[PDB]
Amino acid sequence: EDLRLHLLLNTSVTCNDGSPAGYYLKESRGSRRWLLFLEGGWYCFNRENCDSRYDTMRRLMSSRDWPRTRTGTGILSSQPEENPYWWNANMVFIPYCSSDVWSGASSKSEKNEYAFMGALIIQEVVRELLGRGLSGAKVLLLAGSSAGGTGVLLNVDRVAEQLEKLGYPAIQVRGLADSGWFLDNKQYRHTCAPTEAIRRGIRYWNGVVPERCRRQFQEGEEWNCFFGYKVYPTLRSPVFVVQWLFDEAQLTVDNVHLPVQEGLRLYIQNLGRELRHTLKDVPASFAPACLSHEIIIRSHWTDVQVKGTSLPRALHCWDRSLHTPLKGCPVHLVDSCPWPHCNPSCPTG
Ligand SMILES: COC(=O)C(=O)n1ccc2c(Cl)cccc21
Numbered sequence: 575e576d577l578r579l580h581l582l583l584n585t586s587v588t589c590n591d592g593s594p595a596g597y598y599l600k601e602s603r604g605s606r607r608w609l610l611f612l613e614g615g616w617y618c619f620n621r622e623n624c625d626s627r628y629d630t631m632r633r634l635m636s637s638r639d640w641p642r643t644r645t646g647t648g649i650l651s652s653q654p655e656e657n658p659y660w661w662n663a664n665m666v667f668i669p670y671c672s673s674d675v676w677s678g679a680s681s682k683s684e685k686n687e688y689a690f691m692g693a694l695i696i697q698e699v700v701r702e703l704l705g706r707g708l709s710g711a712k713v714l715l716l717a718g719s720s721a722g723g724t725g726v727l728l729n730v731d732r733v734a735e736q737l738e739k740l741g742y743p744a745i746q747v748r749g750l751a752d753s754g755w756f757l758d759n760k761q762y763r764h765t766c767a768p769t770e771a772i773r774r775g776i777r778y779w780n781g782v783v784p785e786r787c788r789r790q791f792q793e794g795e796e797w798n799c800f801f802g803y804k805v806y807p808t809l810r811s812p813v814f815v816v817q818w819l820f821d822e823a824q825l826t827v828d829n830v831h832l833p834v835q836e837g838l839r840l841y842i843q844n845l846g847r848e849l850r851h852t853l854k855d856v857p858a859s860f861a862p863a864c865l866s867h868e869i870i871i872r873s874h875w876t877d878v879q880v881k882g883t884s885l886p887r888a889l890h891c892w893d894r895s896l897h898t899p900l901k902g903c904p905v906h907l908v909d910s911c912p913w914p915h916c917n918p919s920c921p922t923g
């Protein structure tokens with residue numbers, strides 16, 4: 575139970591229900607690497623579905639019942655056996671309690687039953703960490719899984735700009751977006767689809783998107799910036815993208831529920847090809863042909879390989895690339911085989 579809870583000293587930066595947001599921290603003295611991980615866990619986009627989430631997913635909306643410690647797992651583990659990549663880093667787990675894909679900047683008030691402060695939670699965690707050693711960092715890796723991976727894409731440049739404005743231009747801000755790279759495609763069977771939900775959420779949350787992406791799609795169309803293949807080209811920070819080709823959350827929002835017949839076989843194969851296409855020009859990426867969801871904080875995240883390279887190895891190669899491609903140390907790893915578990919190293923379930 576190595577990461578210790580700190581509730582935000584600025585108690586106006588809150589979870590959905592107005593309780594203080596926070597972060598779990600395990601410091602590594604003398605490491606200048608900082609890993610800030612954004613938890614995932616879907617979202618809610620109106621009073622009714624947020625009220626339901628408050629009843630049976632309350633830890634995702636409130637800090638009142640958070641434990642005082644959490645154990646770092648996967649990329650948040652401090653044991654080299656479990657985390658070959660960054661076991662010696664300063665470790666931060668930021669609980670997802672804003673239900674807004676880390677995009678919101680609205681307080682709970684007279685007019686708002688819930689606060690949606692995800693974007694501000696990230697800025698406040700960064701601000702308070704500077705006094706706990708982040709000021710001496712050389713790399714800040716903003717990582718995240720599922721809604722947290724989309725949160726990385728939405729916030730990594732804002733963290734870089736925040737540190738630049740606060741007078742810390744030496745800190746290299748980077749992003750690692752795990753299972754947050756979704757397609758606004760056709761559902762397999764046509765209730766709120768992966769487009770309308772984000773459209774409603776933005777209004778309900780007062781959600782904010784990266785500025786260059788906002789300037790392309792403009793008012794009313796900022797929902798576009800929640801989609802990795804649209805927002806990624808606008809980003810300036812280096813971002814490593816981890817995405818299963820047949821992501822279970824993607825299939826869920828596509829109304830696919832797994833003897834597969836022709837129509838569904840073609841649908842699933844087309845989905846993998848489309849995902850693979852959107853990553854063709856993403857130089858740092860890890861995209862195995864598996865039916866799964868999330869990876870980087872799983873204890874067995876070291877097991878999966880693409881073309882014989884594990885994700886911890888790919889991330890280490892990425893680190894080296896950010897010191898021409900490296901001999902035997904690849905960073906672009908996208909499966910080409912066209913069906914779930916055509917990669918033998920896929921998670922077993
Ligand atoms: C469980 O997965 C999530 O919680 C999540 O973040 N998402 C699920 C669909 C989706 C889309 Cl379509 C765009 C951006 C984020 C999305």
Ligand SMILES: *[C@@H]1O[C@H](CO)[C@@H](O)[C@H](O)[C@H]1NC(C)=O
Pocket residue numbers: 584586587694
């Ligand atoms: C607390 O956070 C709010 C919202 O981000 C901000 O407006 C305010 O300046 C902060 N206050 C302090 C004392 O940091």
